[PDB]
């Protein structure tokens, strides 16, 4: 039901190890759409725009979702590929955020149906803790390694 | 929960004021026992055109805008002072819904902040003092040590780093999706002291 503590001693070398654990625990607890994430894109004037897409696939190169290539988000990524993704796992007192560049997948990802992979430049993990004081760890990709920091909730 | 999910959504079910429909949806989400009906994902953009996201709680709303409280030294506050253009998303996908709001984030006045702050319980009031939000911390003891410390506090004073923001209602999108249907998708766009209302393709 409830899972308690996120300490720097429990952290895996690969942030995706933590993601995968959390992702599967979300499916285990039958959350609606455990693969659902909110994509933030930015338009030509600096306006952020948001919508929910599904995580189809992930690995160390990126996180993958599909969308229409004529869609509003598709156009925005063309002008500016900087995006954020967030998994709203607040039902289990959790967030996960990914900062990266969205890059169109190739045609052979198997007309106007398309796919994007967001690089892993940052991955933040948020988990709700004792005395309503959350555990926050940010992985920042640097020099083919991850710099990890506790952040104040 | 499918009592609400089942029906389509069309112009003829839309009120002229979009907060009427938002309030309806919010209420249903509370009635449907959703985890945190008032939680919304706030999107900001840094100096480099890179968007950042995080969940916050909707505290108040009316025609002036939607309001949340945050730490004023946090990453989002700084991002907002450089670029006030934000987005809010209410991730109501258990009910196959999304409401997104576009507008501008302006700081609440001190006196606004004082009112809400006073309505909270003493726990959350002390809570506001603890964490230098978003800043790099050596370890969890630093917070816990300070949280325990602040139990020597009695009328609770207001931190100068604790306030909030009102996001204006420039655009509001409603999204009523479903299983195997095309999504019903409506944009309220503020113009000339009125709402231009359009169905968007899913
Ligand atoms: C649970 C859920 C999953 C969704 N998954 C996708 C998806 O994988 N791809 C997609 O294009 N839209 C998806 N949508 C719809 C989007 O939220 C959005 O309405 C659509 O992509 C158009 O966005 P845009 O006009 O900003 O480009 C989903 C909606 C919900 C509620
Ligand atoms: C359910 C839920 C509600 C939250 N509500 C708030 C809030 O009301 N205000 C706030 O500053 N942070 C809130 N947070 C924490 C933010 O998601 C985020 O971790 C923090 O504000 C720092 O964001 P920043 O580093 O981008 O400024 C909440 C988190 C969750 C899971
Ligand atoms: C601006 C606008 N909104 C909405 C619609 C469709 O409304 P509904 O399908 O809800 O009756 C149309 C159809 O042309 C339109 O032009």
Residue numbers in the entry:
A (entry chain AAA): 17 to 126, 176 to 218
B (entry chain BBB): 14 to 166, 170 to 218
Paper lines:
By using FMN as cofactor, PNPO catalyzes the oxidation of both pyridoxine 5’-phosphate (PNP) and pyridoxamine 5’-phosphate to PLP, reducing molecular oxygen to hydrogen peroxide. We have recently demonstrated that ePNPO undergoes an allosteric feedback inhibition by PLP, through a mechanism in which binding of substrate at the active site and binding of PLP at an allosteric site negatively affect each other to a large extent. We recently showed that an ePNPO quadruple variant (K72I/Y129F/R133L/H199A; ePNPOqm), which has a drastically reduced capability to bind PNP (and therefore PLP) at the active site, is still able to bind PLP at the allosteric site.
The final model of the PLP-bound ePNPOqm (PLP-ePNPOqm) was refined to 2.42 Å resolution; the asymmetric unit contains a 353-residue dimer (residues/chain: 17/A–126/A; 176/A–218/A; 14/B–166/B; 170/B–218/B), one FMN molecule per subunit, one sulphate ion in subunit A, one PLP molecule with 0.81 occupancy in subunit B, and 45 water molecules. In contrast to the symmetrical ePNPOqm structure, the PLP-ePNPOqm is the first ever characterized structure of the enzyme crystallized in a P61 space group, in which the dimer is asymmetric. In addition, a small network of hydrogen bonds takes place between Arg23 and the PLP phosphate group by means of a bridging water molecule, HOH419, whose role is apparently to contribute to stabilizing PLP lodging in the cavity; this effect is enhanced by the pyridine ring, able to coordinate Arg24 and Arg215 via the deprotonated nitrogen atom. The superimposition of PLP-ePNPOqm and ePNPOqm revealed important differences between the two structures, highlighting the structural change induced by PLP binding to the allosteric site.
